[PDB]
Amino acid sequence: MKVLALRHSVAQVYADTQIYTHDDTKDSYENAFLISNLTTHNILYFNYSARTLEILNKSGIAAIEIQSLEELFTLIRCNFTYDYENNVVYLHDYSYYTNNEIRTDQHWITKTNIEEYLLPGWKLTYVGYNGNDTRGHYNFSFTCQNAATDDDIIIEYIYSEALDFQNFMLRKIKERMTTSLPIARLSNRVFRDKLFPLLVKKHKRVVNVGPRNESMFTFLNFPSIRQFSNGPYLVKNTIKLKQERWLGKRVSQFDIGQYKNMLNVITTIYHYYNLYQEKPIIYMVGSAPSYWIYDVRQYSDFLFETWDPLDTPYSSIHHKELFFAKDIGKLKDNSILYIDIRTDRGNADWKEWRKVVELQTISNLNLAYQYLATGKSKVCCVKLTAMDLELPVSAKLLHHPTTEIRSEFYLLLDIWDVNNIKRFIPKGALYSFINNVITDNVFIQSPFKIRTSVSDYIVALYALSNDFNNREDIINLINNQKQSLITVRINNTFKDEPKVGFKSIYDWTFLPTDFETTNAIVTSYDGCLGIFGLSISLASKPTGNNHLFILNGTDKYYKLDQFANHTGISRRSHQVRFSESATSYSGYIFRDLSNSNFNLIGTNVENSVSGHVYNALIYYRYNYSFDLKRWIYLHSVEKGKYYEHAPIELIYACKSAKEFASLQDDLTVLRYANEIENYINKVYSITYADDPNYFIGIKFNNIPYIYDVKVPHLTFGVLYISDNMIPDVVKIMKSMKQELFGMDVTTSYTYMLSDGVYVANVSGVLATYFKMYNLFYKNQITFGQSRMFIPHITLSFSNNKTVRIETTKLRIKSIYLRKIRGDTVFDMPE
Amino acid sequence: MKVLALRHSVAQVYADTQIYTHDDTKDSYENAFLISNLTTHNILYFNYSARTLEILNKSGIAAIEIQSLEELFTLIRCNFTYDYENNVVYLHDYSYYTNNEIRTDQHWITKTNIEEYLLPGWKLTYVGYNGNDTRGHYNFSFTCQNAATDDDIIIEYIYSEALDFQNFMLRKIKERMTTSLPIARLSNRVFRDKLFPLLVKKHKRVVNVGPRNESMFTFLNFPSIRQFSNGPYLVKNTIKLKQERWLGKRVSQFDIGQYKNMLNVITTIYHYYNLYQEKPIIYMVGSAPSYWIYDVRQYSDFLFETWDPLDTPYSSIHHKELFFAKDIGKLKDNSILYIDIRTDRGNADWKEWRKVVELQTISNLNLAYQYLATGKSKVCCVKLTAMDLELPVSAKLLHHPTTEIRSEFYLLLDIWDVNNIKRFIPKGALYSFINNVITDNVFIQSPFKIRTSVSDYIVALYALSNDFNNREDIINLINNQKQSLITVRINNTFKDEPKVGFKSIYDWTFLPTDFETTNAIVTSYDGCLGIFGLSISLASKPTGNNHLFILNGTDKYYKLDQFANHTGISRRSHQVRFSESATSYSGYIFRDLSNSNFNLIGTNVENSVSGHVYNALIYYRYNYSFDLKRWIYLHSVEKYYEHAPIELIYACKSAKEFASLQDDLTVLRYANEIENYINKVYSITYADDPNYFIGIKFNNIPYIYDVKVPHLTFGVLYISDNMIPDVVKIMKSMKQELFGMDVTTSYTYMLSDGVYVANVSGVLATYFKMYNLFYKNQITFGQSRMFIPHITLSFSNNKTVRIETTKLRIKSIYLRKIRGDTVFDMPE
Amino acid sequence: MKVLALRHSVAQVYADTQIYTHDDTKDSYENAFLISNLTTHNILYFNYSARTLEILNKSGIAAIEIQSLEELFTLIRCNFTYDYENNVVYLHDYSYYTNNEIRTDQHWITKTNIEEYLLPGWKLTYVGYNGNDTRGHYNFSFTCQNAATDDDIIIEYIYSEALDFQNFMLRKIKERMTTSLPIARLSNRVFRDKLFPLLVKKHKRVVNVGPRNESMFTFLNFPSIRQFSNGPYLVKNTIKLKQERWLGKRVSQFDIGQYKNMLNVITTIYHYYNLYQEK
Ligand SMILES: Nc1nc2c(ncn2[C@@H]2O[C@H](COP(=O)(O)O)[C@@H](O)[C@H]2O)c(=O)[nH]1
Ligand SMILES: Nc1nc2c(ncn2[C@@H]2O[C@H](COP(=O)(O)O)[C@@H](O)[C@H]2O)c(=O)[nH]1
C-alpha cells in the first residue's frame, strides 16, 4: 500500500497519479488505522510519526521515510519489498530496459556467447542475487537496490525447446510490458532468503515440503533442513520405457553446458545433504570452465577440488592440471564426486567416435564404482552415454537441460547403489529417457507424508494445496501441528467451489473457518510477510492466486493489535461507501434492517451494534489479512483489551452478513458467515432470557414528550434467574452504580417501535449496557434476549406521529430491579 | 468525477475518502485535461480557472463551486447531475431513508391508504418532480435538490402482482442498499426533461422512437412530437383468445384505482396527439377522487370539465355536480371524453348486481357512441364490464393495472371507429383478456419503420438496439440521417460477440467504427450530457449496459475541443502505468518494440510517436466518449496538434499487437478498423524505393566516426525530375525553421547488426510538419517503416557510449540524388 | 431396456421404431448378456427362454412374455415398471389425455368443485394408488395398470399461489408433452410401496432418513419405522418474526380445506408414531 512519509517542512506538491495525503497528531495506532483505510495506491504522510510507520510496516504496509525528495521520492514510483528491520528497499522494476540491457542473477551466463543472439546493441549485465550489485545506482537515505531480473525469461527459453532467442526475448519482453508486475514471484525470493536463516537459527529441526527449482540456491548453506520433493527417476523404472533411437534436438542457441553441470552438482549436494546433514567436500573431474562455482559461493562457502588440463578459475584448489585416472586415494571420506569426462570430438567417422565415447563411458562408470567402494559417507555423479550397459537398479537418473539432446545422461550413485542388483539396459531405453524426459527439479527427495510431526518445524510454502493431495489430511496437519508455516489456496470464488484450476490443473480451496487451529495466525501474504519483518508496496487483489498463510505456534499470536491486525479492513468498504453506493449510510442502514431494527432507522449512524465482523465477512477477499478468528478468540479471554464488546454484537454482524450474501447470491460469504457465527457460539456459551422473570429498569425525573402511560421507565435489562441469585444481581448492579449514574442520557425524538407502541429514543446508554451484559454473562446470569436490545422509553400503546426536539438530557432518579408481572420491586438504589 | 473547486478563502483540507487535489496557473487548457486524467472519484480544485471548470463541465464532468465547507462540502459526498447552464444540482442520494420515509414524485399517491401498509412509524412524503420540494432543505451557494425517489418500488409493486406491500418495500430497500446506485435510471429522468423542450423549440419536427411508461409525463405538453411505440391491442385480435371465466385476483393492498384512471386518460391524450397534432379539451364523467389532475397539471395545462354527483375533484372546472346522462351537446368538438360511471354497488345479490353493471355498461357504451357520432376531432374512452357485446373491430382495448382483476376493462374509440365494422365478442373472451393482459404502456402508437426521414429530428432513446430490429436498417438510419439523436449498445465484450443479453433478451452491439457518419458526434452518455448543458459526477463503468450516443447534424460538431473531447483519455492508462505496471515506462517501451524501434530504448521517454490514439483504442471501454473518428477527420481537413498520419497508423499497429497479446478481439478489430479509416481519409504513399533524399550536415561530431561523410538523412522521397523545383520551394518555405530547431545528441547506439549511429533529438516535430507539407503538395515523402533520426557513424558493430547533451552545427541542408554524386541544392 | 419375448410361432413382424431382434439356443446367461448389449430401446425376443427372462429381470431389464400380440404388444409402446415376482405391469403413460381427463391418486379431490375450472368438457377420474382401479382397462396375460397420474400438477398448483387453474393445467400439460417422461418420480412410488413392507418384515429396526411429503401415505401402516426429517416450527422461534397485519391471499380457485385437514391429521399421526411406536 506504499505509504511514503516525507518531511512536513518539505511538503512538496506534485500531481502524481493514485496519490493521497494524510497527517494527524491525535493517536499513533489510529493514524495507522486511518491510513490503512485510504483507497489509493500511494499515500503521502506529512506528520510522519515514526511509531505509525513502524505499525504500518508490522502490518505489511510499506512505510518509509523520504528525505531526498529530488530523487528518493521520484525513484519510488514503482513497487518494492521493504526489509524494515534492516531498512533496505528491494525494487521490483523493469525500467532498466531503457538501458538496452537484460539483467540476470547468475554470473556464469556472462561467459557464454549469449550477447550475440540478443537484439542488436543489447547487453546482459549481472546484478547479483536480488540486485545486490545495483546498490551503486541508488545512494539514498536507505540502502536501495533493484531486485528485478530477466532470469525467468532465460530459464523458460532453456526449458522451452524453441530455438530462436531473438524473437523469444522480444516476445517475452513485450509480454512483460503488457501484463501486470509479477510481485509474488519477485518478493518471494526476498522472503525465502530472509525466512529460512531465521528458522534455522530460531528452531531445532526444519522440514521444507516441496521445494522447487527456483530456490535451489536458497538451501545451499542449510544442510540442517530436511527437504521433501517428488520422487527420483530410478533405473528400475526404465522397464516401462519404449525403445527409441538417436534424436538430435537442439534446444538453445548459446552453450548451456554449464547450467547442466551446475544443476548436476547441486542435485548431488542436496542428495548428500538428505543422507548426511553436513556440507560435503566437492570433487570434480573435467568441468574445466567451472564458472558457476562463483554463483554457488555467493550462498555458501565450499571446498572445491578440480582435475582438468585446462584452467578452472574459482576452484578452491586445482589439485592437478593433469588428468585423473588412478588417483582414487587422494579422495577424502566425506565427499561427492562429479565425473564429466569427454575425451574429444575427434575428426574421425561418427561410428569410430561413438566407440571411443562408449569405452570412455565405461571407464567413467568404473571410476565411480571404485570411488564409492572404498569409504563410508560419500556420493557421486557420472556422465554416461546411451549404450547397452548394466547399471544398478536403485541408482538415480539425471538429464538436466543441455544445449543439444545428443545421447548423454548422468547417473547419481550413493554407496548403497554400488553393491546392489544390476540390470542390463539397452541403448534404446536410455535414448528414450534422454529424448522424453528432462529433469524438472534438482530436489530428488522422497515425497512428504502429510502427518503432524512433534519435533519438526514444517514449512509448506506452495506445495500442499493441490488437486491430488488428501484434503482432510491437509486440514488435520494445519489443525494439529505445532510450529509450522503452511500455505493454502483461499477460495475467493463465489458459489463456493471447492477446487479452482487452470487447464485441467486444479487446487483445493479453503476458507479461514475450514480450520480449527488452537494457537495460530491465519493471515495473508502481507500479514505473514510482516510477521517476518518485511512489508510490500502492493496488496493482494481480491480475484487471484491468493493464498492463506498459517503460522502455528508463533511468538506473535498474542500480539493481537501488532501483527495480522485490522489494518485495511475498511479500505474496500470506504471506497464502495463513498463512490458507488446509493448512500453513505447504506451500511448502518442495511445492518439495522438485517437485524429487524427497521422500527426506526433514524440516525442510526450513531450507536449501531454490529462490529468489525461485517467487513471481515463481506470483504474477506480484500481484508483476509485480518485473522478474524484470532481477533474473536483473544477478545473472548481478556487475559476486550481495547473494545470490550458483547458477543451479541458479533452475532448481529454475522446475521447481517448472511442476509447480504443471500441478496448478492455470494454462496461463499454465506457459508463463511454461518461458520463464523458457529465459532462465536462455540467460544461464548451464550444464553437468552426469552422468557424473563425479572428485569432491570431505570426511572427518569423529567420526560420531554407527551406520555400517556402511568410509569415512564427504560427497561435497561431483562434476565432469567432463580430467586437465590437476586443478591448476586444486586451486587453486580452496585459494581457499576457510579458508572450507571455517570452516563450522559439523551433523547432527541419519538418513534413507533411496533404496531400499537409509541416510544422515545434513548441515547448514550448502549456502551454501558454492553459492559453490564459482559458482567452478567461472566457471572453465569442469563441476561439479554434473542432479539436485539433497543433502549426505549415506551410512551403510549397508541399509534402516534413522530416528533423531534433538540437534544435534551435526561436525568436518572432511581435504578430498580423488579419482578416481571409483579408490582414488587426488589431493589431501588438512588 | 466530482470536481469540487474551493476558493483560497476555503482552502481548508480534510481527509475525505477517495479524495484528490489539483491546482495550477501555468497552463491553459491542460488544467482540465490533467484533472480529467486523475484516478479517484472526488477531486478538489484549489487555484481554479473558471475556464477549465467550464471545459470540464462541457465534457460531462461535474465541476462545482464550493463555498460552504460546513454544509455544502459535507453534503456533496454523493453523486449528482449538474445543470451547469442554470447552475442547479440534482442529488441522487437515498440517505433520506434515515427519516423513516418513502419519497414519491407523484401527488395522487399521498391520498391513498398507502401509509397504513408501510413499516410501522414510516411515512410517505411527497417530493417535487425531480425533488422540487427539497430546495428548501438545502441553503447553498447554488440551487440544490434531491432527485432520488422510491417510485421504482411502488411501480414494480403495482406491476408485479405481489400482495404484501410491507415486505415488498422492505426487501426492495435492502436491495437498494446492497446494489450500486441506479444513476442511468435517475439522471436520465433529468436528461429527458431538459432534452425534449430544447428540441421542440430548436427544431421543427420531432419524432420520438419507442417511449416507455417511465417518460409518460414528459411528453404531455408537446403534441408537436410524433411518437412511435409497440402498437395497440385491437378488438380484431381478440379472436385468438381462449374463453375464460371471472377470476378475482387482488394486486394491491391499497386502492390504486386512481392510477388506472390516470393511465387511461393519458393513453387517450397521447392517442389524440397522434391523430390531430394539437392539445384537446378533457371531459370526464364519474372520476370522484380527481387528484391525479394535480400531477398531470404540473407538466402541462389542460381544461378539465367533470360531471360528478355530489363530489368535487381537485382542479376540474365542475360544469355540473349533478349526474351526467344525456348532456352530449355540452361537449365541444375538439375534445376527449373519459366515461368512468361510478356504478355504485350495495348489499344486493351478486347475480342481480352483475345485471345492474351490465345495464350500466350498455348505457356508457351508448354514451360514447353519441359522443363520437358528431364532431370532426374527438377521441373517447369508456369503462365496460365483461359481457357479451358488439364492439367496433378497430377499437383499442386498455386494461391498465388496477386494485383487483374484477371483470372490468376500458375501450378506446376513434371517430373512425364508430363508422367501422362491429363484431360480436363473447364474455369468455373478455374475461380472458382481463385475466391474462395488463397494458404495459400508455403509448399505443404504431411501430417506427427504420427509414431515414429528411425533415424530422428523430430521437431513439434506448429503443433501436435490440435483437429483433434489423441491424443493417439501424446502421443505415444512423449513417444517412440529417438530424437525429440515436442510442445503441456498445460492444464492450472482450471476445468480439455482436450480441449481449440476459434471460433470452438480447441486444445488438456496435463499435464506433461500425458507422460511417458524415457530420456526427459518436460519444458516451457523459459527452451527450455535456452537449446539452448537463454534467455528471461519475462516468460509466466499462462493462455495464453502456450505450453509444450518436448526434447527427449538430451545431457542435466542428467545436472539437469543447464537446466529446479527449478528457479522460489517459485516466485508466495512467492508473495502469503507475500502480500495477511492470514499469512506469511500460507504455512507451511497448509502442517502440511493436513498431520495430527495439534497436534502442534510450530516447523513448522523449519524442515517441502517437499515443493519443493508443489509449483511445485499447482503453476504449473507459474513454469511448472520445469519438476518435471525428478527431481523425477534423485533423485531416483543418477545421493544432499538427500530427503526421503515419503517427496515427503506428499507434494502430501497436494497439493491434497489444490486443493480439491480450486476446482482446474487440480491440483488435477496432484497431484494424481505425487504421482502415486513417488510410481512407489520408491517401498515404510511401517512398519504399527511394529516388532522392534530404540530408543535413554538421561540423561537430562528439564521437569517433569511421564513415567518410557523416550526415543526418532527414528525408526520403520518390519524385519525378519535373517536381525537383517544387520540392525546393517547400524546403525554402521552412528554411529558417529548419535551422531554428535546437538539435541535440546524447549517446551512440546500434541501429542494426553492423550499424553504429548516434541518436538525434529535437528534429522529429519539424520532420512531421514537413511531412504534412509534402503530403498536402502530393509529393511522395517518407517510408513504410518508422523514421529514426540518426547520424550513421560506422558499420563497425561497436558498443554504445553516452555523453552530455551536445548541440549540433547544421552547417548545411541539401537535397541529393540517391546513389548520385549530384546534390541539387545546398542552402547556408 | 424393455425386452419383450413373444412366441416364435407367432413371430409377427412390423416396423416399430427403435426395435431389435434376438434369439438363440446356446446358453441361458449369455443370451441375456448378448441381449443386454443391444443398442436400441425395445428388443424382440423370439426363442424366449424363461431362464433368460428371469436373468434380465434380476438385472433390472424389463423382460416379459407377450401372448396377445394384437393388444398386449401394441399397448407396450410405452415405458413401465415391472414387478416380476408378482408379474404386474405398471404403465407410466400419459396417453389418457386423449380421453379429455386428468388422473389423480386421491379420492377426496373428486368431491371438490374442481371440474368447473378445467378446460371445457374435461373431467378428472380417480384411478387409485399407482392406478389400481385401472386394471379393468387392460386384461392381458399379466395384471396390468397405468401408474401415471397428474397429481404432481395439482400439488404444484396448490403450493404455487398462482390463481388461474385453467391456464395452469394447460401450461403444465403442454410442458409434459414437451419434456421427457419423469421415470424416476413415477417408478419410485412403486419402489417405495414395495420396498418398505419388505424391510419392516425382514428387519428388526428400520430408520428412514429425510422422508418427503410425497411418501406421506407410504408409512401410514408402519409405525415401527423411525423417521428423521427437518426440525419442526416451534412457538419459541416466533420471537425472530417481524410483526405483520392481516393479508388475504387466495391460492386456489377450488376449496382445498380438506387437503389442509388431511395434512394436519397425518402430521399428528406421524408425531404420535415418533413418540409411541403404535397406531
Ligand atoms: N459497531 C461497530 N461499528 C464499527 C466498528 N468499527 C468500525 N465501525 C463502523 O464502521 C464504519 C467504517 O466502516 P464502513 O461502515 O464504512 O464499512 C465506522 O464509521 C464505524 O461506524 C466496531 O468495532 N463496532
Ligand atoms: N494524449 C497524448 N499523450 C501522449 C502523446 N504522445 C506521448 N504521450 C504520452 O502518453 C502519456 C499518456 O499516458 P500513457 O498511457 O502513454 O502512459 C502522456 O503522459 C505522454 O507522456 C500524444 O500525442 N497524446
Side-chain angles (χ1 to χ4, degrees), chain C residues 189-202:
Chain C
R189 291 180 179 162
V190 173
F191 181 45
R192 289 186 209 122
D193 281 342
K194 191 169 184 290
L195 161 65
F196 280 119
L198 300 210
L199 282 185
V200 169
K201 161 172 175 186
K202 177 175 168 55

Side-chain angles (χ1 to χ4, degrees), chain A residues 404-630:
Chain A
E404 203 203 1
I405 306 306
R406 217 222 66 74
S407 74
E408 102 165 320
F409 76 103
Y410 285 71
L411 195 68
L412 189 64
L413 284 177
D414 44 52
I415 88 164
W416 297 257
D417 285 315
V418 165
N419 293 311
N420 211 350
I421 309 187
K422 305 188 173 69
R423 201 190 286 176
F424 175 83
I425 307 146
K427 68 171 174 210
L430 284 187
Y431 269 111
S432 177
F433 167 66
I434 296 176
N435 294 344
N436 288 8
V437 185
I438 298 292
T439 310
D440 66 316
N441 194 342
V442 317
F443 298 79
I444 48 188
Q445 286 65 328
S446 59
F448 170 75
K449 302 204 60 77
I450 303 168
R451 287 301 166 294
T452 79
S453 177
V454 193
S455 324
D456 288 316
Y457 194 104
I458 315 184
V459 182
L461 270 199
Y462 292 109
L464 291 213
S465 69
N466 202 312
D467 204 10
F468 61 102
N469 290 105
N470 179 299
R471 169 183 182 96
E472 303 303 319
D473 283 353
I474 290 184
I475 285 188
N476 276 47
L477 180 63
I478 285 159
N479 265 349
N480 292 334
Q481 168 78 11
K482 315 171 159 190
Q483 306 172 126
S484 75
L485 174 50
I486 307 177
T487 286
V488 294
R489 272 299 315 263
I490 279 181
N491 183 102
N492 43 4
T493 167
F494 315 78
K495 298 296 185 300
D496 192 5
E497 283 162 10
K499 59 184 44 168
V500 70
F502 181 66
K503 200 266 170 291
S504 79
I505 312 129
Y506 286 67
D507 270 358
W508 291 121
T509 67
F510 314 83
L511 282 191
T513 320
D514 280 340
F515 313 115
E516 275 163 17
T517 321
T518 326
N519 189 334
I521 288 185
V522 183
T523 188
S524 78
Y525 174 79
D526 321 320
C528 171
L529 215 57
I531 298 186
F532 292 83
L534 299 107
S535 66
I536 207 189
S537 310
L538 187 51
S540 309
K541 275 207 189 173
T543 286
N545 241 7
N546 289 345
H547 288 79
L548 289 176
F549 286 63
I550 314 190
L551 303 103
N552 293 321
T554 172
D555 322 324
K556 274 53 175 175
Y557 177 93
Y558 286 97
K559 307 177 161 181
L560 177 48
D561 296 306
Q562 309 246 291
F563 296 92
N565 52 16
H566 61 178
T567 54
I569 183 157
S570 298
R571 193 165 100 142
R572 179 57 191 188
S573 299
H574 281 189
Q575 175 165 357
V576 152
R577 181 172 129 127
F578 281 33
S579 67
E580 310 140 26
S581 59
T583 170
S584 61
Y585 293 172
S586 68
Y588 307 73
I589 289 182
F590 182 73
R591 300 184 218 149
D592 280 305
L593 292 150
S594 306
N595 282 297
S596 297
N597 188 15
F598 39 59
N599 34 47
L600 164 88
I601 186 176
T603 315
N604 63 358
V605 54
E606 295 167 1
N607 287 359
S608 205
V609 295
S610 296
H612 285 40
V613 200
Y614 190 80
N615 306 13
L617 300 187
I618 277 45
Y619 301 99
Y620 88 93
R621 321 199 165 75
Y622 308 81
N623 57 56
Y624 70 100
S625 64
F626 179 43
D627 194 323
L628 174 70
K629 287 186 81 166
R630 166 177 79 144

Side-chain angles (χ1 to χ4, degrees), chain B residues 116 118 120 163-164 166-167 170 174 242-250 253 436, chain C residues 116-117 119 161-164 166-167 170 242-250 253:
Chain B
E116 302 204 7
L118 304 180
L163 244 195
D164 171 12
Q166 188 180 192
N167 290 129
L170 174 64
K174 291 185 270 204
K242 85 177 196 72
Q243 294 201 35
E244 272 173 25
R245 274 161 192 156
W246 178 100
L247 182 272
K249 214 179 197 159
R250 187 210 280 192
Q253 279 171 291
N436 283 3
Chain C
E116 304 202 4
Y117 298 82
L119 283 178
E161 278 163 349
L163 249 193
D164 173 11
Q166 267 215 14
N167 291 310
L170 173 62
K242 320 154 178 178
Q243 290 203 37
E244 272 175 28
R245 275 156 281 193
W246 182 98
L247 165 60
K249 210 196 194 162
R250 180 154 144 250
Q253 279 171 289

